[PDB]
Every structure is written in C-alpha cells, then in structure tokens.
Design a binder for this molecule. Structure first.
Ligand SMILES: [Ca+2]
Lengths: 43, 43, 43, 43
C-alpha cells in the first residue's frame, strides 16, 4: 500500500503539470480573442 | 501511509483550485466568442 | 485511513464531474469558432 | 483499503483520459483562432 500510494502521489503531480500547461494555453486563447474582438470594433 | 495520505489530499486541493480557474476562464472565453459572433451578424 | 480514503474517492468523482462539465462547454466553443470562421470565408 | 486503493486508481485513469482530451481540443481551438485572426488581417 505504501508503494501503491506513492505511485498515486507521483501520478497526481504529473496530472497537475498537464493542467498547468493547459492553463497557460487557455490564457493565450484569451489574448487572441481580445485581439480579434478589438479588430472588429476598429472596423 | 498517514503521511502519504496527507500528500494525496494536498495535491487534490491544488487540482480543485486549478480546475475551478479553468472553469472561470471558460466563461470569459465563451462570452468573448458570443460578442464576436454578434458583430459578424451585425456587420 | 478507510474513511479518509473514502473521502478521497468521493472528492475525485466530484472533480471528474467538473471536468465533464468543462468538456461540454469547450466543445460548444468549437462549434462557435467553426461558425465564426465560416462567416468570414463567406464574406 | 486495498479495495479503496483500486477505486482511487480507476478514477485517476479516467481523469487522465479526460485531461488528455481537453488538451487535444485546445489545439483544435487555438488553430481555429489563429485562422480567424489571419483573415481579419488579410481582409
Ligand atoms: Ca477554450
């Protein structure tokens, strides 16, 4: 159970890394959406 | 195992916070998209 | 440890529900993005 | 606790699959956004 639970902890931290990466990319989308909207308002 | 239980709980609280922030950013994104869509119809 | 691990399982299933909900909303964004792109190609 | 360990592992595998799918949909989304952005510049 000790080793099995140690694997669980490692796998959780791995999935947190995936979520952090996803978060950064989703923020990049907000920057693009804002830029697109501004271009339409300008036109 | 009580120590590793504490590690698991800690990681899960971190995950919850990150998922919660993904959800609030999703809201921001879709409402931008809907504005953009409105303007392409209006134009 | 039994009750503590039972709480962990419940909290995991709860976070899976959040992720499922987020997934559905993210798909809705793809539909909007596709529609926006088509409107530009049309114009 | 061995039974509850199996429940935890099962939920974590499900989560991984769902996060993985969120990441591939993110790719689809941003490349649509970039196309849209290109066209507003080109137009
Ligand atoms: Ca998105």
């Amino acid at each position: 159970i000790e080793k099995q639970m140690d694997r669980v902890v490692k796998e959780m931290r791995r999935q947190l890394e995936m979520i952090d990466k996803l978060t950064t990319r989703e923020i990049e989308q907000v920057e693009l959406l804002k830029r697109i909207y501004d271009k339409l308002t300008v036109q």
